[PDB]
Design a protein around this ligand. Structure first.
Ligand SMILES: CC(=O)O[C@H]1C(=O)[C@@]2(C)[C@H]([C@H](OC(=O)c3ccccc3)[C@]3(O)C[C@H](OC(=O)[C@H](O)[C@@H](NC(=O)c4ccccc4)c4ccccc4)C(C)=C1C3(C)C)[C@]1(OC(C)=O)CO[C@@H]1C[C@@H]2O
Ligand SMILES: Nc1nc2c(ncn2[C@@H]2O[C@H](COP(=O)(O)CP(=O)(O)OP(=O)(O)O)[C@@H](O)[C@H]2O)c(=O)[nH]1
Ligand SMILES: Nc1nc2c(ncn2[C@@H]2O[C@H](COP(=O)(O)OP(=O)(O)OP(=O)(O)O)[C@@H](O)[C@H]2O)c(=O)[nH]1
Ligand SMILES: [Mg+2]
Ligand SMILES: [Mg+2]
Lengths: 426, 430
């Protein structure tokens, strides 16, 4: 039944997911224990994609919850929806990655990697025929990158023919919260290119501007910065869980939007995004939503869509609509803004319509556009990398865990070649 | 897990720790007997029932001050295996405290540590408190950190040394204690501190506004600096900075490991009602020259990497807004090739202060620990004070018969000479 198994590697990944499993449950009527209390039967027709029915009339999350420290686990258990998780899944050490890449990739997680890898093989057999690997992590610390890159290259050994979904928050120049953020990127460039099929790129920078301005809100906490990413990841997986007129599931999106073996970095998008005040001053319809979708200030990756082209956008509509109204709005924008799209690919839009909206609206959407403006986000990290390596600064925390000079020379050429492909085909 | 040990070598180290353990028993709800009428596994170990003992091995070579602990209110938390007592001290001599007298009793402290070290499984690090002007904490520790480093491999070690001022200094041969302790500063401790006696006396009368600053108020302020590194082990938070996470952000090079602390809000008892002590202010308070624990100005020396460690009612949105303003500043300048120099942790607890203390009950706090380039000019104040006493060969005759020789004195000068020279090398851009 096209199942999806879920890994969360790192504190941000363990907190994006802890609300992602909160938002995905009230779609399906899951109580805080694990039983069904929903209303529509269309929930239970495909409930078995994120769930295993355990006996007694209960359900469990197919989720494998990875840290190297017990501190984040305690927040997971004692927080919202802790009890629903299966207590065999919490595979975690006691040491700590220390915000080192090589400690989560050569030293500490490297002797816990198999004890992760056999809770997923148990979850690989509660399913009829799986397809989904949701990995939620960072590019900021140790458990996000080094524990979240060795782990993908092990799942590729078992499954050379599934689809991989990273959800990778990126480092920004404005909000730079640690000191070695440029070292937790270029090392993880090397194996999120050639071993993942899609890679959503979310930033901490642009995700505050949505909270101050578009939502008109004064206190952006992380439980709101996550709670936007939760409602994007609750949107791409809608065709696996609900019927719709023009349906498009996870491979069907990923075959239309990815024209090349490497250019598969996406940015999300979500509409409506209104305050508690500007509710009554808005009238929900397809031109209401589609114009907000294509805004320059509704891209969570902190880049300007005006500074580049899109190659292949796609929108995933939800709610009872009419097709021509959705067809003509997508017809409108390729006519209106034909300079901002690629000239050698016709019909850039792949519509997807689901008959079920998010809970308690009239409609909603989810935007994903494989733009060219991603070429700027890596230059904001490639030049932060360029200074710190040129002095060979901070090199003694990495040579002391097994790394080498050679691992830093080749990794720049990998991030060199990536921006060398958006620009060559823009 | 996550446990670490305290060693209080010297009269400086004990009386600092005499309030550092006053503070922690206050924090966790622990009466001085050991009773707690969760968190405390960083410094404690619960034994039996209703008893908590610390990781407190107090080492001394003279029985005066330790007997005060054994008759003070904190005699019951500690148990009489712990308190190593000597007979007759170094008395501000090196080669007594290292080569001669401490050779007797240092076997008694190591086999007291390992009956306390192999009881915890979550060994984090060491907190060796001493000075650079004692005779106990001067060169006896230079023997002791060449014992635990042989035993414990590459574990983290943190020394918190009191450092001599140019003007206010209360001994004579203090330009001889500091040059010889450098060989166990670059080699047997990976996060080595400097705190001045001068620079805190300016704070007790201008920020706290008290006319008589003595040692029991010079030191209660250092207890709050130690209590903020360990808010991330002992407590949770939105962002947490573990004590091995701390050093990888902070320390940029294999030998430069000299941060300097500071703290805010250091304000008076009745100046609180009017000051609007906000997140944009107390972050801005960490860059005034009148909030330095070391007598040096933050302006003539450029920063390299600070590590903001907050505590209290702080959300992370405005820490970005407070650090946005400080990056727009032009006099607060960084070395250019470290384009981000910011690391932020947050505790959820309120920072607390001692009843009968001198500080004000606030609801936010910040403890910056910056690595910078200005503090190498807090060494030329003391290389000069050494430069003339050996020039006339003064005070040599107390060391020759006690073990110390001449040829190391010319040799331990390059131990400091290259060390000032290397901040000149990595402070300049290109
Ligand atoms: C009276 C009314 O219509 O209220 C709306 C509303 O005012 C607005 C402003 C909502 C509101 O959303 C937020 O303010 C919000 C806060 C944190 C993070 C993101 C959003 C709403 O809270 C959110 C809520 O969303 C849902 O009910 C969806 O099913 C949504 N659910 C959750 O995110 C969720 C929240 C808590 C607990 C469990 C689930 C969802 C979206 C996608 C996939 C699955 C679920 C809605 C429509 C409303 C309120 C209540 C005010 C908006 O968001 C959503 C997700 O719909 C923000 O912009 C939209 C437009 C809505 O009109
Ligand atoms: N949007 C969100 N960003 C977050 C959240 N938690 C942390 N972060 C951001 O992620 C970065 C910190 O990453 P982490 O705590 O995930 C590092 P991790 O725990 O994976 O490994 P360690 O190095 O072992 O700590 C930094 O940019 C934070 O500001 C969250 O809930 N939402
Ligand atoms: N901040 C602070 N400094 C102190 C304190 N007690 C002593 N000092 C300083 O420490 C230095 C003197 O060293 P002591 O610690 O007394 O000497 P010692 O380590 O006991 O060595 P000997 O007595 O010579 O064996 C001087 O610079 C004093 O100002 C204290 O409680 N607080
Ligand atoms: Mg972590
Ligand atoms: Mg003494």
């Amino acid at each position: 039944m096209r199942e999806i198994v879920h890994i969360q590697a790192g504190q941000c990944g363990n907190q994006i997911g802890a609300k992602f499993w909160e938002v995905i449950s009230d779609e399906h009527g899951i109580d805080p224990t694990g039983t069904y209390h929903g209303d529509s039967d269309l929930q239970l027709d495909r409930i078995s994609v994120y769930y295993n029915e355990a006996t007694g009339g209960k359900y469990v999350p197919r989720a494998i919850l990875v840290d190297l420290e017990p501190g984040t686990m305690d927040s997971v258990r004692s927080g919202p929806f802790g009890q629903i998780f299966r207590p065999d899944n919490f595979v975690f050490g006691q040491s700590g990655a220390g915000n080192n890449w090589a400690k989560g990739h050569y030293t500490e997680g490297a002797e816990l990697v198999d004890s992760v890898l056999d809770v997923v093989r148990k979850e690989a057999e509660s399913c009829d025929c799986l397809q989904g690997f949701q990995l939620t992590h960072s590019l900021g610390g140790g458990t996000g990158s080094g524990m979240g890159t060795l782990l993908i290259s092990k799942i590729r050994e078992e499954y050379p023919d599934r689809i991989m979904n990273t959800f990778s928050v990126v480092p920004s120049p404005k909000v730079s919260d640690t000191v070695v953020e440029p070292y937790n990127a270029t090392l993880s460039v090397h194996q999120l290119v050639e071993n993942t099929d899609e890679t959503y790129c979310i930033d901490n920078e642009a995700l505050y501007d949505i909270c101050f301005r578009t939502l008109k809100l004064t206190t952006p906490t992380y439980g709101d910065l996550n709670h936007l990413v939760s409602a994007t990841m609750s949107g791409v997986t809608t065709c696996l869980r609900f019927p719709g007129q023009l349906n498009a599931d996870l491979r069907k999106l990923a075959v239309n939007m990815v024209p090349f073996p490497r250019l598969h970095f996406f940015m999300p998008g979500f509409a409506p995004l209104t305050s508690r005040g500007s509710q009554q001053y808005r009238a929900l319809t397809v031109p209401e939503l589609t114009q907000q979708v294509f805004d320059a200030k509704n891209m969570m990756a902190a880049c300007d869509p005006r500074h580049g082209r899109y190659l292949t956008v796609a929108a995933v509509f939800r709610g009872r609509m009419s097709m021509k109204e959705v067809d003509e709005q997508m017809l409108n924008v390729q006519n209106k803004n034909s300079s901002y799209f690629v000239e050698w690919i016709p019909n850039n839009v792949k519509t997807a319509v689901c008959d079920i909206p998010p809970r308690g609206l009239k409609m909603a959407v989810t935007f994903i556009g494989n733009s060219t403006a991603i070429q700027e986000l890596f230059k904001r990290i490639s030049e932060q990398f360029t200074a710190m390596f040129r002095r060979k600064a901070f090199l003694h925390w990495y040579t002391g865990e097994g790394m080498d000079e050679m691992e830093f020379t080749e990794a720049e050429s990998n991030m060199n070649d990536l921006v060398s492909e958006y620009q060559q085909y823009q | 897990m996550r446990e670490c040990i305290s060693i209080h070598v010297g009269q400086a180290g004990v009386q600092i720790g005499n309030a550092c353990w006053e503070l922690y028993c206050l924090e966790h709800g622990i009466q001085p007997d050991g009773q707690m009428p969760d968190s405390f596994n960083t410094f404690f170990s619960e034994t039996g029932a209703g008893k908590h003992v610390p990781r407190a091995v107090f080492v001394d070579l003279e029985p005066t001050v330790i007997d005060e602990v054994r008759t003070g209110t904190y005699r019951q938390l500690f148990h009489p295996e712990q308190l190593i007592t000597g007979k007759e001290d170094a008395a501000n001599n090196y080669a007594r405290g290292h080569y001669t007298i401490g050779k007797e009793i240092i076997d008694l402290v190591l086999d007291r540590i390992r009956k306390l070290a192999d009881q915890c499984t979550g060994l984090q690090g060491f907190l060796v408190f001493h000075s650079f002007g004692g005779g106990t904490g001067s060169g006896f520790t230079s023997l002791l950190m060449e014992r635990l480093s042989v035993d414990y491999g590459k574990k983290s070690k943190l020394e918190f040394s009191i450092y001599p001022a140019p003007q206010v200094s209360t001994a004579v041969v203090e330009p001889y204690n500091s040059i010889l302790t450098t060989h166990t500063t670059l080699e047997h401790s990976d996060c080595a501190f400097m705190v001045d006696n001068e620079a805190i006396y300016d704070i007790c009368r201008r920020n706290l506004d008290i006319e008589r600053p003595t040692y029991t108020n010079l030191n209660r302020l250092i207890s709050q600096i130690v209590s903020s590194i360990t808010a991330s082990l002992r407590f949770d938070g939105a962002l947490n900075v573990d004590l091995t996470e701390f050093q990888t952000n902070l320390v940029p090079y294999p030998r430069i490991h000299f941060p300097l602390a500071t703290y805010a809000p250091v304000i008076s008892a009745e100046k609180a009602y009017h000051e609007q002590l906000s997140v944009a202010e107390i972050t801005n308070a960490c860059f005034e020259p009148a909030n330095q624990m070391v007598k040096c100005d933050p302006r003539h020396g450029k920063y390299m990497a600070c590590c903001l460690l907050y505590r209290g009612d702080v959300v992370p949105k405005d820490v970005n807004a407070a650090i946005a303003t400080i990056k727009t500043k032009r006099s607060i300048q960084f070395v250019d090739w470290c384009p981000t120099g910011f690391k932020v942790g947050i505790n959820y607890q309120p920072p607390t202060v001692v009843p009968g203390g001198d500080l004000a009950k606030v609801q936010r706090a910040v403890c910056m620990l910056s690595n910078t380039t200005a503090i190498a000019e807090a060494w030329a104040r003391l290389d000069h004070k050494f430069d003339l006493m050996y020039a006339k060969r003064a005070f040599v005759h107390w060391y020759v018969g006690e073990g110390m020789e001449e040829g190391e004195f010319s040799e331990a000068r390059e131990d400091m000479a290259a060390l000032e020279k290397d901040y000149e090398e990595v402070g300049v851009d290109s």
